[PDB]
RNA sequence: GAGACUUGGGCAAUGUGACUGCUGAUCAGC
RNA sequence: GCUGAUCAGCAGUCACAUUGCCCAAGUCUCUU
């Protein structure tokens, strides 16, 4: 009943889901009322963030041998920073299904994928426009519940690494630094 | 011939009856009162400098409001060789640690503060009452109901009963609301809830000694036509503002918080909704009561108060209400302008034009006013007079200083003389007709009333109580007087000699308000002739009956630590644990409260709640409570709410969220339940 | 009149007298009904209709004459005022004027 | 009406 | 050909710590009726009392350590004079002279 | 911004105290 | 037919004790 366009979501994420309370507690934001049955989203953010930072720097210190640390370490901090992951999940439209009932949240979503489609879904320069950390922490939680659904980091990395993949090819070609 | 005060005859026996039993001493407003006060503090001050955990003791003086406090404070720290501190909400008083409060207790001999804090302070085992060697409570009329006042008295029935502290009780009025009839039940009531019997002074030597200080003004009456017949301009105001709101209905802004009534039987609109009505109803009385000009004024107010609310506002949707109502607030100003200026062609001199047209578009009561206040200060000396007005509504502060400033710069005679000033209650009225986005004008209202600046003061009910203010040598109530206390206080403001009290009253009117002002001196005629008449030799009340006093509520909670959880206190702690749990600034939701229907609370209770209210509530999704706790079946629904919160409170106490002070647990005192556990190597390298 | 100043008497019109037409802007406009027009319904009525008038002029409210009241008066708009009153109507003191 | 009625000024303060 | 009350006189003049401490608002209690003002000379023994009593009272108001005396001096006769107002008047003096 | 407290006015719905309109029953008098 | 007494039913009015909504004023605390 909560979760609506299931299909679409599963689809447009890459991975279809067993069990849907992970799912459900993936897109539910705290100030959601209506969801008595699962927590909110800060329960499996906490696992995403982590296992994504992780994962992160198993790939690039595996594959991206030529640079040197100090590079290294702006690439991983590039790569986990909040505002690449609004942007992908932006672009990956995941943010439809977030299950909010705050306006001020609605109203700088909507500033922020209005924003986001002016540059074609593209991570313009660490991007005037306020970014809502809950689009990252959805999509950290979100990441969270496919690895707890399966058990299985190599999945969990393919879905990682099919949503990553143009920021991940991009950023080991330059490096953001500010 | 000598400058300090020494006591007198009558403060010496209030003393002297204090020091052996407490009491609640019952005078008129004035120094008499607040010496009295000082003069208890003194002595019993005997261990106030030997540390508590040698058996010392302090003192407390305990405020009904912060100003008040703030005053009392300075008045003790001025008037007394001790050192006082003064402990209120702007404090941040809530995050204070144990050590923050012994410390604080080991520098000050006497704490100043507002009821609540004190009362916090003390539930949550910071002080207990043995450390206290007496309390003052000032204006404790106002300990009825559930009020601080009466909740700290509560604790009272709980703790040892050997080591009590001595309770006194300043008051210039005994009463609160209009419950003068039966005068001796209420005083009995109030002598319950506290532990003492009323004193006041009978000798004829001691009520002329008292009268050195306090004054009784001559009180008149100032009536004036009242009419009914309204102009068409308001009849188009009136329509145009029936036509936004219809359009209101439908505005859709962004979804908003539910809002419901008192006792949750019926819905309401959004506060944001709510805002803009209160405000166009609050015209809308003002343009009926005063006058076409007072609307002038008022309008500005209002276009002011909207520009202010759409640059706070965050959402677009907010931002265009704000718009839609400043636009129809323009409109309405344009027309009550163009009605003011199709007058003009009488004559080209303007000075006395304005007040011409001030004096045309003014109800009969405005043009009384007015004129009472022409004929009181026609020539004098701005240092000559120093004057109150007043009035109920706040904004009809705003729209009467207003106005009084137009006025004053409009005749020959008053322009030098009289300098208006205002202020109202909490939720302070921008005081600006102008709406700029900072000025550089400081000094408040009631310091420049205080500093002489100012002489002729429009409150709202604000100066009636507690603020100190010097004597008054007019006070005009330009509306109707509402209750009794605020009759007998605002009386006591005309303090000066031969001061002049003032009633507005309609024609259709007289006969009530002078039949309920005749009721009020009756009151105090019982009051008195039963403080007199009454003899009592254990001049306190029994045990029996202070506990049959403080039985009917919900019966407090303790733990082994002596900490408690009041009742009435169960909300407030409900709703600032649910506070701290977000960790964002959207995260915020306040537990869902759910009146169960007939068939529900059938189903869950059966026949042993039939009848009664219960009260269902739903905690946010972060929190660990996720069990719906019930209330109690209780008879009515406020009861039922405050059962259900109480049961709430405790089971988050029980789940370890309270720290055994039923306050929310910070992540200080988190991290330290874990420090020995996974932090324990610390420990050999000297940090923790 | 909301005007209680006191004020001072130059010459009186026996010549004039109440209903007589305004000499300047108000000719279609009489003393009498002008005054029932303003304040009529504080006066009720005017006795001794056909009696004399007077002429008033008013006196400055200041106390202190040291300094030159510099200004652009416009002398001739300033006399433009011309009051005429009704003698019944208003309050008189016998105290000399000069 | 188009005219708040007018007070006069003979009002005095009646002592209550 | 008009003061103050003779017997507030000698308590002001004849009392230099108490002298610091009446303030307009004391001198707001004051309200001589016309027997007193005319006949008498000096406030009653009711009102004295009163106003000497506001006046101690003074000293643990909000009003104490103020200074009254740019709003009071002149019922006393005293003036504050800044410095240079002396010396250019000695000057001033020394300059007619010449 | 939320939550809570005391007080007053207006209105409506329950009880209870008194009276009135009207009708019936029982009873006395005519 | 006429009046009183008792009693029941209903409607209207008056007061009080509860309850509920709306509005007004004042107060406190939490939090940014």
């Known amino acids: 009943g909560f979760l609506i366009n299931h299909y679409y979501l599963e689809k447009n994420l890459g991975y279809t889901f067993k ?59 590039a790569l986990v920073n909040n ?31 209005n924003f986001q489609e002016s540059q074609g879904h593209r991570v313009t320069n660490y991007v005037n426009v306020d970014v809502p950390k809950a689009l990252g922490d959805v999509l950290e939680a979100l990441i969270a519940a496919v690895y707890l659904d399966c058990r299985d980091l190599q999945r969990t990395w393919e879905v990682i690494f099919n949503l990553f993949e143009p920021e991940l090819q991009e950023f080991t070609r330059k490096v953001p630094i500010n | 011939e000598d400058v300090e005060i020494k006591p007198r005859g009558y403060q010496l026996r209030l003393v002297d009856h204090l020091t052996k039993s407490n009491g609640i001493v019952y005078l008129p407003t004035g120094s008499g009162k607040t010496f009295v006060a000082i003069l208890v503090l003194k002595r019993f001050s005997q261990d106030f400098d030997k540390p508590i955990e040698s058996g ?50 080991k520098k000050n001999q006497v704490l100043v503060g507002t009821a609540q804090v004190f009362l916090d302070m003390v539930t949550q085992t910071y002080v207990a009452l043995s450390s206290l060697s007496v309390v003052i409570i000032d204006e404790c009329h106002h300990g009825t109901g559930h009020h601080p006042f009466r909740e700290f008295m509560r604790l009272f029935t709980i703790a040892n009963q050997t080591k009590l502290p001595r309770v006194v009780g300043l008051t210039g009025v005994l009463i609160k609301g209009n419950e003068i009839t039966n005068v001796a039940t209420k005083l009995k009531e109030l002598e319950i809830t506290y532990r003492g019997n009323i004193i006041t002074v009978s000798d004829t030597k001691e009520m002329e000694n008292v009268m050195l200080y306090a004054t009784k003004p001559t009180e008149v009456m100032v009536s004036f036509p009242h009419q009914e017949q309204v102009l068409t301009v308001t009849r188009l105001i009136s329509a145009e503002i029936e036509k936004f709101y219809v359009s209101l209905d439908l505005m859709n802004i962004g979804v908003q918080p539910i809002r419901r009534s008192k006792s949750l039987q019926c819905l309401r609109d959004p ?13 809308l009385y003002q343009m009926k009561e005063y006058g076409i000009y007072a609307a002038s004024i008022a309008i500005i107010s209002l276009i002011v108060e909207f520009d202010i609310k759409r640059r706070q506002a965050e959402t677009l949707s907010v931002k265009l209400m704000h718009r839609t109502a400043l636009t129809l607030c323009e409109k309405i100003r344009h027309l009550l302008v163009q009605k003011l200026q199709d007058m003009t062609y009488d004559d080209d001199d303007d000075n006395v034009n304005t007040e011409e047209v001030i004096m045309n578009f003014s109800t009969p009561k405005v043009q009384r006013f007015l004129m009472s206040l022409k004929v009181s200060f026609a020539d004098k000396d701005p240092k000559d007079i120093c004057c109150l007005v007043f009035v109920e509504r706040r904004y009809t502060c705003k729209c009467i200083y207003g106005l009084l400033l137009n006025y004053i710069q409009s005749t020959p005679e008053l322009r030098n003389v009289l300098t208006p000033q205002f202020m109202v209650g909490r939720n302070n009225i921008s005081p600006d007709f102008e709406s700029v986005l900072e000025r550089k004008w400081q000094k408040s209202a009631i310091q420049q009333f205080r500093d002489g600046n100012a002489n002729l003061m429009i409150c709202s009910s604000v100066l009636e109580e507690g603020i100190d203010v010097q004597a008054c040598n007019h006070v005009f109530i330009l509306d109707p007087v509402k209750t009794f206390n605020m009759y007998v206080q605002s009386k006591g403001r005309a303090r000066t000699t031969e001061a002049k009290f003032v009633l507005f009253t309609a024609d259709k009117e007289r006969e009530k308000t002078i039949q309920q002002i005749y009721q009020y001196r009756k009151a105090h005629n019982d009051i008195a002739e039963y403080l007199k008449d009454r003899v009592l030799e254990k001049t306190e009340p029994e045990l029996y ?77 972060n929190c660990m409570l996720r069990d719906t706790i019930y209330s109690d079946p209780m008879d009515n629904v406020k009861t039922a709410k405050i059962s259900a919160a109480f049961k709430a409170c405790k089971v988050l106490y029980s789940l370890g969220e309270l720290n055994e002070r039923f306050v929310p647990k910070t992540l200080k005192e988190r991290v330290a339940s874990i420090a020995d556990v996974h932090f324990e190597h610390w420990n050999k390298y000297g940090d923790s | 009149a909301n005007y209680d100043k006191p004020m001072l008497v130059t010459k009186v019109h026996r010549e004039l007298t109440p209903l007589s037409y305004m000499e300047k802007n108000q000719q279609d406009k009489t003393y009498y009904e002008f005054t029932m027009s303003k304040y009529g319904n504080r006066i009720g009525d005017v006795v001794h209709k ?17 300094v030159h009241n510099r200004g652009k008066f416009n002398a001739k708009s300033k006399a433009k005022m011309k009051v005429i009153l009704i003698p019944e109507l208003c309050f008189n003191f016998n105290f000399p004027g000069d | 009406i188009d005219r708040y009625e007018q007070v006069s000024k003979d009002f005095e303060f009646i002592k209550i | 050909g008009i003061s103050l009350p003779h017997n507030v006189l000698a308590l002001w003049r004849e009392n230099p710590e108490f002298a610091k401490i009446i303030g307009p608002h004391n001198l707001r209690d004051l309200a001589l009726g016309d027997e007193e003002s005319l006949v008498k000379g000096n406030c009653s023994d009711i009102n004295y009392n009163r106003f000497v009593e506001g006046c101690r009272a003074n000293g643990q108001s909000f009003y104490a350590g103020a200074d009254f005396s740019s709003e009071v001096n002149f019922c006393v006769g005293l003036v504050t004079i800044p410095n240079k107002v002396i010396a250019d008047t000695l000057e001033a003096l020394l300059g007619v002279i010449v």
Not at chain 1, 88 to 102: D, P, Q, T, W, Y
Not at chain 1, 105 to 111: C, D, P
Not at chain 2, 86 to 94: L, N, S
């Open chain 1, 83 to 113: 505002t690449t992951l609004a942007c992908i999940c932006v672009r990956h439209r995941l943010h439809f299904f977030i299950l909010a009932e705050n306006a001020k949240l609605s109203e700088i979503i909507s500033k922020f994928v």
């Open chain 3, 50 to 66: 056909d009696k004399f008038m007077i002429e008033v002029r008013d006196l400055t409210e200041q106390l202190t004459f040291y």
């Open chain 2, 56 to 105: 010392g003791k302090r003192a407390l003086f305990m405020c009904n409001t912060v100003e008040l406090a703030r005053q009392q404070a300075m008045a003790v720290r001025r008037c007394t060789n001790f050192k006082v501190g003064f402990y209120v909400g702007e404090q941040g008083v809530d995050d204070w640690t144990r050590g923050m409060w012994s410390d604080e207790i």
């Open chain 2, 545 to 621: 009956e202070i506990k049959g006093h403080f039985q009917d509520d919900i019966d407090p909670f303790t733990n082994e630590n002596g900490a408690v959880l009041l009742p009435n206190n169960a909300l407030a702690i409900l709703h600032r644990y649910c506070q701290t749990i977000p960790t964002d600034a959207f995260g915020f939701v306040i537990p869902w409260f759910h009146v169960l229907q007939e068939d529900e609370r059938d189903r869950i209770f059966g026949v042993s709640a039939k009848g009664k209210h219960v009260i269902s509530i739903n905690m946010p999704v």
């Open chain 2, 271 to 283: 506060s944001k909704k709510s805002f803009v009505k209160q405000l166009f109803n609050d015209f």
């Open chain 1, 19 to 77: 069990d849907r309370r992970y799912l459900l507690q993936a897109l539910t934001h705290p100030s959601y009322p209506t969801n008595r049955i699962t927590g909110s989203y800060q329960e499996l953010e906490f696992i995403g963030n982590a296992i994504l930072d992780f994962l992160i720097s198993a790939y690039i210190f595996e594959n991206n041998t030529k640079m040197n640390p100090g590079a290294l370490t702006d690439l991983r901090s």
